[PDB]
C-alpha cells in the first residue's frame, strides 16, 4: 500500500497523485514525483535566489517546456499554463514518464530527465550550471526508495 510521506506538503501530494492517476501508476509514480520535486525545488521553498527559480516545481527549462506543449495538451485536455502549479507538475510528469518508458528504467528516466537525452559528465544547463545527472539519479532514486517506492 502507498501513503503520503509526512515531509511532503499536502498541496504537493495532491498534485503528484493527480499526475499519478493520469498515468494509472497505483500511487507509485506519486512517490517518485515527490522525490523529484524535493530535489528540484524543495516543494517550492528552494526556488528563490536561483537563476532557474522561474522554471517552477519540476524545474522544466523554457526550451523543454516549449518542445512538449502539444503533447501536454493532448495528454491533459488543456494548454499548459506555467502559472498553474498542477500544470507544472503535469508537465514534469509527462516528460519523466516519457523518459522512463523510452529508456526502459526508472534510473535511466531520472538521469536523462535532469541531463536531457545527450548528457555527458561536464555538460551545462540553460543557465550554464554543471549538470550532475548521475548524482541526481542516485539520490533521487534513494529518496524514492525511502518513501516506499516498489519498482
Ligand X SMILES: CC(=O)N[C@@H]1[C@@H](O)[C@H](O[C@@H]2O[C@H](CO)[C@@H](O)[C@H](O)[C@H]2NC(C)=O)[C@@H](CO)O[C@H]1O
The residue number with the shortest CB distance to ligand X is 116
Residue 1 vs 122, nearer CB to ligand X = 122
HEC letters along 19-65? HHHHHCCCCHHHHHHHHHHHHHHHHHCCCCCCCCHHHCCCCCCHHHH
Distances in Å between the alpha carbon of 106 and those of 33, 91, 95? 11, 17, 13
Residue 67 vs 79, nearer CB to ligand X = 67
Q: How far is the CB of 128 from ligand X (least distance, A)?
A: 10
Task: Centre a 10 Å sphere on the Cβ of residue 148 and count the other Cβ atoms it contains.
Answer: 13
Residue 2 vs 64, nearer CB to ligand X = 64
Residue 23 vs 43, nearer CB to ligand X = 43
Q: How far is the CB of 48 from ligand X (least distance, A)?
A: 8
The binding site for ligand X (CB under 6 A) comprises 39-42, 46-47, 50, 52-53, 59-61, 63-64, 67, 113-114, 116-119, 123, 125-126, 136
Q: Please give the Cα distance from 35 to 134 (Å, whole number).
A: 15
Amino acid at each position: 500500500t502507498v501513503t503520503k510521506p509526512a515531509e511532503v506538503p499536502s498541496r504537493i501530494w495532491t498534485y503528484v497523485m493527480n499526475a499519478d492517476n493520469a498515468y494509472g501508476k497505483g500511487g507509485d509514480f506519486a512517490l517518485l514525483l515527490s522525490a523529484v520535486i524535493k530535489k528540484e525545488s524543495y516543494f517550492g521553498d528552494g526556488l528563490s535566489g536561483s537563476p532557474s527559480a522561474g522554471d517552477g516545481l519540476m524545474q522544466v527549462e523554457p526550451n523543454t517546456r516549449n518542445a512538449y506543449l502539444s503533447q501536454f495538451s493532448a495528454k491533459y485536455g488543456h494548454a499548459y499554463n506555467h502559472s498553474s502549479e498542477q500544470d507544472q507538475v503535469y508537465m514534469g510528469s509527462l516528460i519523466l514518464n516519457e523518459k522512463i518508458v523510452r529508456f526502459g528504467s526508472i534510473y535511466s528516466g531520472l538521469l536523462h530527465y535532469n541531463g536531457g537525452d545527450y548528457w555527458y559528465p561536464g555538460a551545462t544547463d540553460s543557465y550554464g550550471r554543471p549538470i550532475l545527472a548521475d548524482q541526481y539519479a542516485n539520490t533521487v532514486y534513494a529518496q524514492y526508495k525511502s518513501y516506499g517506492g516498489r519498482y
